[PDB]
Amino acid sequence: MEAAHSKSTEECLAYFGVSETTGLTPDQVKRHLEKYGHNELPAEEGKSLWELVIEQFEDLLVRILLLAACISFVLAWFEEGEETITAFVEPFVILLILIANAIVGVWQERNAENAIEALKEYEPEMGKVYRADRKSVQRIKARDIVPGDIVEVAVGDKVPADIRILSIKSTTLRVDQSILTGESVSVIKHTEPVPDPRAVNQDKKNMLFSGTNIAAGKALGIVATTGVSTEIGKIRDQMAATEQDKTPLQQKLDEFGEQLSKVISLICVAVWLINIGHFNDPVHGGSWIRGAIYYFKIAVALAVAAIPEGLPAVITTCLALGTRRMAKKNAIVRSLPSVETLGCTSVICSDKTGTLTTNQMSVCKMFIIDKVDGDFCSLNEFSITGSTYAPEGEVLKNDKPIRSGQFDGLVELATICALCNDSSLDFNETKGVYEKVGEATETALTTLVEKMNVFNTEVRNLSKVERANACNSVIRQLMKKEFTLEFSRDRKSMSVYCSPAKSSRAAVGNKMFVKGAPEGVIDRCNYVRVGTTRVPMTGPVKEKILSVIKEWGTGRDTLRCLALATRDTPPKREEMVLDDSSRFMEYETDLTFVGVVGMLDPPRKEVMGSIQLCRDAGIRVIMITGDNKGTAIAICRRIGIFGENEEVADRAYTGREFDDLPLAEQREACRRACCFARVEPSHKSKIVEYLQSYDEITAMTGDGVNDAPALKKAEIGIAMGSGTAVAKTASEMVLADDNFSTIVAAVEEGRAIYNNMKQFIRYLISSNVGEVVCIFLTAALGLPEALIPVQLLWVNLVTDGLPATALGFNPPDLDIMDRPPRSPKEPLISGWLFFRYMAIGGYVGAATVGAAAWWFMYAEDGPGVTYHQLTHFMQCTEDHPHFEGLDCEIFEAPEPMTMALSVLVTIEMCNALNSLSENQSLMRMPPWVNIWLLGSICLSMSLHFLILYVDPLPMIFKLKALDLTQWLMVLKISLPVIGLDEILKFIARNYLEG
């Protein structure tokens, strides 16, 4: 722990007693680990509080029923009902259905968080450190980083710990500190001490803070603090209310829930108004307001039934369920609305290098100039064995292993690859594998130098650790790297200014070693090196070099190519200003061509299959890369974006070609082109921007810092697990698996969510409407009451609870990935879907009423009398109108209220079976595709059988179970409602794109 950023670079090194270039010894690391602990915060085991998870009572709908149960609890405490126990069942029934959905909701939120945190720990954060047991930089777990050791940081790296800057290898260092200071744009760092000890974080310009990202440059530093002493560690739980808001779909349903409230409220008030006639009816005797209290109970109870109380929980469930499914496929969701938005995605933008490709780079081909004689130019081509970063391979010429030192051109080629390089190799002992340190492109050159061994260095007797950078270290001991002009994606090249290491025997020449994009580098070459000789760049020589480059990139291997050049006579250092990066290209002119390297970069296996699935799902895929167009087009053909011979004359554009187009043509090009090569980070963001101008949901996939602007711009940013931290920071999803196939699954899963949310709405509306229609159909036709305040709360608990919620666990539709992406601005309920809600709601209302009437009109146990209660409901006892009223008490009979109560339950469990798919029949999608639903149906049916035969309960819910013959009628009328929907589903199936 060093608490001072005011100390100099020497004082920091002296404090921990560590050598700047060597790092902490193994014994030092041991002590510092005991004294300062592991560089790990606990992560806080209390991610959530059990009860805090339980608070699912925030939604308006839960609050309504919450209050609704209260009024029935107040109406049960004092008067307002004679038999109190039955009135004490009312609020407990309402509480019962809420807790059921609450348990379900709490459960899924619990499973999600657990699965999320488990997936987050799969890949241990690694850091680059110099330590005494190794000459080259090595990679260790970030938690094993202790205060005092030398840590190396590069572009795209997450800063592993609080670090005092010792040396900036680049000409500048920019850092993204938004996670700590809120500074939107990157800030510049230096090495000079900031004298003030109490200085705020924004002024610590000689410090790197853990959790921040290196925007540009490369630096060497020493850890000041780790663990909880780290600046970002103190503030993680320090401030609250920084959490996420509700998703677009969730906001869409919130709107929907309130509109339902206004309708149901109107209806409930309307139910109260239409029944102000039975004000003074003998049921409550002669009552001026007591008669209203009962119908106020009816209105309130009808609300609770009609209100989709399960809706708030089923959204959170479907979301948490989707996340958990994604978690199983090693996909990390950093932003909740990522899955629902991806479901309605029409265009997927994807980076090529590292994203569409495995980023396991290995130079397998390279050439230098052989002979130059007029219009004649011949090249010395070479092949390199080894597809890994391992320093094991051969340099083949004419299918013969050769010594690269034999060719002077290869000597300088290897020199450039070694010096003009900000990467290295580190052997990981754990299951022994050579790992890259930095960018894969540069490491492929590092392993090349090792394979070439141009100075015949004895490497046989070296360990696998030393061997990783054996030949590279030899070259570095021959030329002192003064400074480095960093790789810039505008000039697309990189150079290093070097002087002879001896500096005593040799002072003959300073050199600039340049590598970069072939086209750019070659253009800035005026000379061509032939061994140790140098000749002027001409037409024929230029054409020869370029044509071979075109061959490799278009070939069956599709080689990523780099040109390597040298400035024989560079400007004196005084004439060079390292301040502006725009003048670096000027410094990299009058170069001497040395050679061209060719890299193998295999596409990921699952990409080709995934693209076809995207094409079938109406999702378009565009490749966006800074690489050569020839190789980009060739890869596009290799992965299926383009056919093998599509001849895509107007479907592929370079950054130059794209800019030469007017704004209108650029915007239109993004519609037709599926391949953008040689483009800058700004182009990637602009392409996504154009696609969104057509009101499209655009997704972006990348791994580098050149994808960062486009990742933040797109609807959904998806990062690679092996990618940079800058890209992950700018993303909504992270694929730790590096599995591109998960994206297609993520799209599919999000559409199941929407469709399941649809079927949930389709079930509850079309069923609860039928409940409402029933109440209206009886009160208007002048029939006895079908239901009672208690009975109303029962058909709610049974039909609007778990059988409703279980629809959230519905399987994806059969043609879910054969239909086009849903437009984001589609109406939640289509104009025609609303007709189903009535067509089903109409029959349910007519089924529940016909049941209570059939007891009155055709039941043998009942009176069995013909039409319409002998035309009126007036009768009650003898001596009223003598219209053959042989029957005495055939009114206020509890058996038909049953009959309605039982049809209502049965017909909704019946209706729920239609909510397995939007338009697919029960034939193609049988009931056993959802076991969770059938269990809820059985539970609801069993709960209804229980409430009817357990003798004290019939007294409460008023039910003499006319068991055999009448349940048949209940089952009989409830059955066509699934038959009708089956016919109703067949219509829209065939009506719209049959």
Ligand X SMILES: Nc1ncnc2c1ncn2[C@@H]1O[C@H](COP(=O)(O)OP(=O)(O)CP(=O)(O)O)[C@@H](O)[C@H]1O
When the beta carbons of 305 and 708 are compared against K ion, the nearer one is 708
Structure tokens at 351: 């980076």
Radius of gyration, CA atoms only, the chain: 38
Q: How far is the CB of 33 from K ion (least distance, A)?
A: 38
- Using CA atoms, how far residue 923 sits from 372, 911, 914, in Å, is 76, 15, 11
Structure tokens at 303: 């609300």
| Residue nearest to K ion as judged by C-beta position | 717
When the beta carbons of 625 and 767 are compared against ligand X, the nearer one is 625
Q: What are the backbone angles phi and psi of residue 367, rounded to the nearest 5°?
A: -140, 160
Residue 51 among known ligand-binding residues: no
Question: Residues 80-88: contacts with CB within 8 Å, 24+ apart?
Answer: 80/293, 85/956, 86/790, 86/956, 87/790
Contact 279, 292 (CB under 8 A): yes
Site string for K ion, 714-743 (x = CB under 5 A): ---x--------------------------
When the beta carbons of 521 and 710 are compared against K ion, the nearer one is 710
Which of K ion, Ca ion, ligand X, none does residue 799 bind to, with CB < 5 to 8 Å depending on kind? Ca ion
Distance of alpha carbon 524 from alpha carbon 504, whole angstroms:
32
Site string for ligand X, 227-246 (x = CB under 6 A): --------------------
Q: CB-based contacts of 254: which residues, under 8 Å, 6+ apart? A: 59, 60, 246
DSSP 643-672: -TT---TTSEEEHHHHHTS-HHHHHHHHHH
Catalytic site positions: 351
Q: Is 862 in the site for K ion (CB under 5 A)?
A: no
Residue 309 among known ligand-binding residues: yes
When the beta carbons of 354 and 885 are compared against ligand X, the nearer one is 354
Q: How far is the CB of 974 from Ca ion (least distance, A)?
A: 13
Q: Is 601 in the site for ligand X (CB under 6 A)?
A: no
CA dihedral sign, ordered 146, 148, 150, 153: positive
Site string for Ca ion, 789-818 (x = CB under 5 A): -------x--xx------------------
Of 58, 292, 65, 62, nearest to 792 by C-alpha is: 65
Which of ligand X, K ion, Ca ion, none does residue 796 bind to, with CB < 5 to 8 Å depending on kind? Ca ion
Q: How far is the CB of 661 from ligand X (least distance, A)?
A: 20
Q: Is 441 in the site for ligand X (CB under 6 A)?
A: yes
When the beta carbons of 404 and 731 are compared against K ion, the nearer one is 731
Structure tokens at 578: 């390292």
Q: How far is the CB of 770 from ligand X (least distance, A)?
A: 57
Which of Ca ion, ligand X, K ion, none does residue 492 bind to, with CB < 5 to 8 Å depending on kind? ligand X
When the beta carbons of 563 and 697 are compared against K ion, the nearer one is 697
Q: Is 562 in the site for ligand X (CB under 6 A)?
A: yes
Single residue of 2, 90, 703, 732 touching Ca ion by CB under 5 A: 703
Q: Is 493 in the site for ligand X (CB under 6 A)?
A: yes
Distance of alpha carbon 449 from alpha carbon 446, whole angstroms:
5
- Using CA atoms, how far residue 173 sits from 207, 216, 813, 873, in Å, is 11, 5, 52, 90
Residue 351 among known ligand-binding residues: yes
Distance of alpha carbon 515 from alpha carbon 551, whole angstroms:
20
Residue 109 among known ligand-binding residues: no
Residue 645 among known ligand-binding residues: no
Using CB under 6 A, which of the segments 167-175, 439-447, 725-733, 983-991 binds ligand X? 439-447
DSSP 378-399: EEEEEEE--SSSSS---EEETT
Strand partners, 382: 366
Structure tokens at 920: 């697919």
Which of ligand X, K ion, Ca ion, none does residue 717 bind to, with CB < 5 to 8 Å depending on kind? K ion
Which of Ca ion, ligand X, K ion, none does residue 625 bind to, with CB < 5 to 8 Å depending on kind? ligand X
Which of K ion, ligand X, Ca ion, none does residue 206 bind to, with CB < 5 to 8 Å depending on kind? none
Q: Is 768 in the site for Ca ion (CB under 5 A)?
A: yes
Q: How far is the CB of 711 from K ion (least distance, A)?
A: 6
Distance of alpha carbon 978 from alpha carbon 964, whole angstroms:
22
Structure tokens at 902: 């039982």
Using CB under 6 A, which of the segments 345-353, 365-373, 383-391, 784-792 binds ligand X? 345-353
Structure tokens at 539: 């037409």
When the beta carbons of 326 and 349 are compared against K ion, the nearer one is 349
Using CB under 6 A, which of the segments 278-286, 429-437, 488-496, 710-718 binds ligand X? 488-496
Contact 280, 286 (CB under 8 A): yes
Cα atoms found within 13 Å of the Cα of residue 915, Cβ hemisphere only: 33
When the beta carbons of 709 and 750 are compared against Ca ion, the nearer one is 709
DSSP 398-453: TTEE--GGGSHHHHHHHHHHHHS-S-EEEEETTTTEEEEES-HHHHHHHHHHHHH-
Single residue of 173, 384, 494, 859 touching ligand X by CB under 6 A: 494
Of 693, 727, 833, nearest to 346 by C-alpha is: 693
Using CB under 6 A, which of the segments 411-419, 484-492, 661-669, 884-892 binds ligand X? 484-492
When the beta carbons of 309 and 442 are compared against ligand X, the nearer one is 442
User: Contacts with K ion in 690-719 (CB under 5 A)?
Assistant: 712, 717
Contact 652, 706 (CB under 8 A): no
**Site size with ligand X, rule: CB under 6 A:** 21
Residue 554 among known ligand-binding residues: no
When the beta carbons of 709 and 885 are compared against K ion, the nearer one is 709
Beta carbons within 10 angstroms of residue 804's beta carbon: 27
Distance of alpha carbon 211 from alpha carbon 223, whole angstroms:
14
Q: How far is the CB of 451 from ligand X (least distance, A)?
A: 19
Site string for Ca ion, 851-890 (x = CB under 5 A): ----------------------------------------
Question: Residues 943-948: contacts with CB within 8 Å, 24+ apart?
Answer: 943/798, 944/798, 944/902, 944/905, 947/794, 948/898
Distance of alpha carbon 465 from alpha carbon 138, whole angstroms:
10
Residue 628 among known ligand-binding residues: no
Which of Ca ion, K ion, ligand X, none does residue 800 bind to, with CB < 5 to 8 Å depending on kind? Ca ion
User: Contacts with ligand X in 503-532 (CB under 6 A)?
Assistant: 515-517
Q: How far is the CB of 831 from ligand X (least distance, A)?
A: 45
Structure tokens at 650: 């107007």
Reduce the DSSP state of residue 596 to 3 states and report it: strand
Contact 823, 832 (CB under 8 A): no
Q: Is 353 in the site for ligand X (CB under 6 A)?
A: yes
Residue 245 among known ligand-binding residues: no
Single residue of 158, 492, 604, 758 touching ligand X by CB under 6 A: 492
Strand partners, 208: 163
Residue 626 among known ligand-binding residues: yes
833-857 vs 741-781: helix axis angle to the nearest 10?
40
Q: CB-based contacts of 695: which residues, under 8 Å, 6+ apart? A: 823, 824, 825
Spell 471-485 as b/e; 16+ CB within 10 A means b: bbbbbbeebebebbb
Single residue of 354, 516, 640, 750 touching Ca ion by CB under 5 A: 354
Spell 150-180 as b/e; 16+ CB within 10 A means b: bbbbbbbbbbbbbbbbbebbbbbbbbbbbbb
Site of interaction with K ion (CB under 5 A): 712, 717
Binding site for ATP: which residues?
A: 353, 442, 489, 515, 560, 625-627, 678, 684, 706
Site of interaction with Ca ion (CB under 5 A): 307, 309, 351, 353-354, 703-704, 767-768, 796, 799-800, 908
Binding site for Ca(2+): which residues?
A: 304-305, 307, 309, 768, 771, 796, 799-800, 908
Binding site: which residues?
A: 304-305, 307, 309, 351, 353, 442, 489, 515, 560, 625-627, 678, 684, 703, 706, 768, 771, 796, 799-800, 908
Binding site for Mg(2+): which residues?
A: 351, 353, 703
Site of interaction with ligand X (CB under 6 A): 351-354, 439, 441-442, 487, 489, 492-494, 515-517, 562, 625-627, 704, 706
